[PDB]
């Protein structure tokens, strides 16, 4: 009584560990009904357009793919509201990449790219944009599988420093020229970001354009210059990520085409 299909009873949650603090505040690890691992976003007051998100959560619930971090439900009766998601034991892809001890083989790096590409192909098939695809917004489970996280939530951020294209928190380094110039988001801006994500993976989580500021990056990419080949990327892998950065959005591949290209390179580089 008093819960829709989207609604989780917060009394069913056991809080176990703090995972960190992001754009909407603290996120914790816990259990649901004593036995199911979950992550719990405790949505900071003022940080989210909550009513709009709650309506969208109904759509997000139905986005189900193995390589997408699942939304399990929301707790909306109380302030702060909670968002309950799939838990990922190996944490953020960016941090995971930066842990040199893993000493990833290039086949593992390509598999990470494929994991993300599968998730993104699924989202593309639902005409659903991520809008902030980057290694920091991917997660890794205890089997080393990478999944895409927090797809679509950018739409509900109430922080001008995140939303404004000249804001301090805006993902300049993952954005195509038409986003930077006209804030024109499309499937093809997710494609561009995916190419940068591939670059992050093969660079083991270096900052894209690490020697530039955001402002200098915007200027660089408007002049047609690009990231260049990470040491661990083969020429074939580099060709794939580079294909994501065509100046003309309509000349960039789809995620289906990228997936096919990644599978081909796996077959050629096994
Ligand atoms: C990390 C981490 N380390 N470890 C070990 C290895 C030490 C573990 C187990 C984790 C871990 N973390 C998660 C999370 C999670 C997701 C998002 C976030 C957080 C945590 C908090 C950190 C800040 C970003 C934070 N962004 C957000 O909440 C958000 N960003 C957005 C954007 C795009 C801005 C729209 N929307 O929500 C979810 C599911 N399983 C997890 N496992």
Swiss-Prot record:
Tissue: Predominantly expressed in B-lymphocytes.
Stretches assigned to the Protein kinase domain: 13-266
Effect of residue 252 to H: In XLA; severe
Residue positions of motif CAV1-binding: 192-199
Localization of this protein: Cytoplasm; Cell membrane; Nucleus; Membrane raft
Binding-site residues, dasatinib: 85-88
Entry PTM: Following B-cell receptor (BCR) engagement, translocates to the plasma membrane where it gets phosphorylated at Tyr-162 by LYN and SYK.
Residue numbers of Phosphoserine PTMs: 215, 234, 270
Active-site residues, as the UniProt record annotates them: 132
Residue positions where Phosphotyrosine is found in the record: 162, 228
Annotated positions binding ATP: 19-27, 41
Sequence positions that bind clofedanol: 85-88, 153
Described function: Non-receptor tyrosine kinase indispensable for B lymphocyte development, differentiation and signaling. Binding of antigen to the B-cell antigen receptor (BCR) triggers signaling that ultimately leads to B-cell activation. After BCR engagement and activation at the plasma membrane, phosphorylates PLCG2 at several sites, igniting the downstream signaling pathway through calcium mobilization, followed by activation of the protein kinase C (PKC) family members. PLCG2 phosphorylation is performed in close cooperation with the adapter protein B-cell linker protein BLNK.
Record's subunit section: Part of a complex composed of EEIG1, TNFRSF11A/RANK, PLCG2, GAB2, TEC and BTK; complex formation increases in the presence of TNFSF11/RANKL. Binds GTF2I through the PH domain. Interacts with SH3BP5 via the SH3 domain. Interacts with IBTK via its PH domain. Interacts with ARID3A, CAV1, FASLG, PIN1, TLR8 and TLR9. Interacts with MPL/TPOR.
Family affiliation: Belongs to the protein kinase superfamily. Tyr protein kinase family. TEC subfamily.
Domain notes: The PH domain mediates the binding to inositol polyphosphate and phosphoinositides, leading to its targeting to the plasma membrane. It is extended in the BTK kinase family by a region designated the TH (Tec homology) domain, which consists of about 80 residues preceding the SH3 domain.
Associated clinical condition: X-linked agammaglobulinemia: Humoral immunodeficiency disease which results in developmental defects in the maturation pathway of B-cells. Affected boys have normal levels of pre-B-cells in their bone marrow but virtually no circulating mature B-lymphocytes. This results in a lack of immunoglobulins of all classes and leads to recurrent bacterial infections like otitis, conjunctivitis, dermatitis, sinusitis in the first few years of life, or even some patients present overwhelming sepsis or meningitis, resulting in death in a few hours. Growth hormone deficiency, isolated, 3, with agammaglobulinemia: An X-linked recessive disorder characterized by growth hormone deficiency, short stature, delayed bone age, agammaglobulinemia with markedly reduced numbers of B cells, and good response to treatment with growth hormone.
This protein's name: Tyrosine-protein kinase BTK
Residues of the full protein shown: 390 to 659 of 659
